[PDB]
Design a protein around this ligand. Structure first.
Ligand SMILES: [Ca+2]
Ligand SMILES: [Ca+2]
Ligand SMILES: [Ca+2]
Length: 211
């Protein structure tokens, strides 16, 4: 039974690239011919994986996209030159491993929040949310750090609010909210993957100051 096969997505270089060479010990008696079935082989996405029919080299023909298909299940077939299957179809599983090629994206372009002017600092005001298509499970490619890029107006302070790096909850950072003077704030919030270090997106948090 065939070992787990793994192919990083977004691969460059010359294609196709060998993945694994499948064999039949059922093939010294007979010349075996290999083929594969499954999505990625004969079924959409067709042609992503091929197998050299005389050698049993399974190859990937193009760069993969983990966010499109992370796991391929293919079946190899070993057929005699005489036209008889010499073995049961062998399942072949190809895991596509993640690259950090999706930038975080906010679920909204503009989040709306409201805070009472007298809200004590540390008061949660609102939440911004971002998603990342990359591999939350096995990488930090989907690990999103939220930040506030800017606040307008910068009054009374540059930093009326703060955002929880992890949760995107925005809180009153300081006192001084004054609905009469500054009815509203526009925060530009950033979501960066790799835990803030990676790829970035921005969104607006419009925060209305209430009585
Ligand atoms: Ca991708
Ligand atoms: Ca990816
Ligand atoms: Ca990412």
């Amino acid at each position: 039974v065939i070992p787990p096969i793994s192919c990083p997505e977004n691969e460059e270089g010359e294609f196709p690239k060998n993945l694994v060479q499948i064999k039949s010990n059922r093939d010294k008696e007979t010349k075996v011919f290999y083929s594969i079935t499954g999505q990625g082989a004969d079924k959409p996405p067709v042609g992503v994986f091929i197998i050299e029919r005389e050698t049993g080299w399974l190859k990937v023909t193009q760069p993969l996209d983990r966010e499109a298909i992370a796991k391929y299940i293919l079946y190899s077939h070993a057929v005699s030159s005489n036209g008889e299957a010499v073995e049961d179809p062998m399942e072949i599983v190809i895991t596509v491993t993640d690259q950090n090629d999706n930038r975080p994206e906010f679920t909204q372009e503009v989040f709306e929040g409201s805070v009472a002017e007298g809200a004590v600092p540390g008061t949660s005001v609102m939440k911004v949310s971002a998603t990342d298509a990359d591999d939350d499970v096995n990488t930090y490619n989907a690990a999103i750090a939220y930040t506030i890029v800017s606040q307008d107006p910068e009054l009374p302070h540059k930093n009326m609010f703060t955002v929880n790096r992890d949760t995107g909850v925005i809180s009153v950072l300081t006192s001084g909210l004054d609905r009469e003077s500054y009815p509203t704030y526009t925060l530009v919030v950033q979501a960066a993957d790799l835990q803030g270090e990676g790829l970035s997106t921005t969104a607006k948090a419009v925060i209305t100051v209430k009585d």
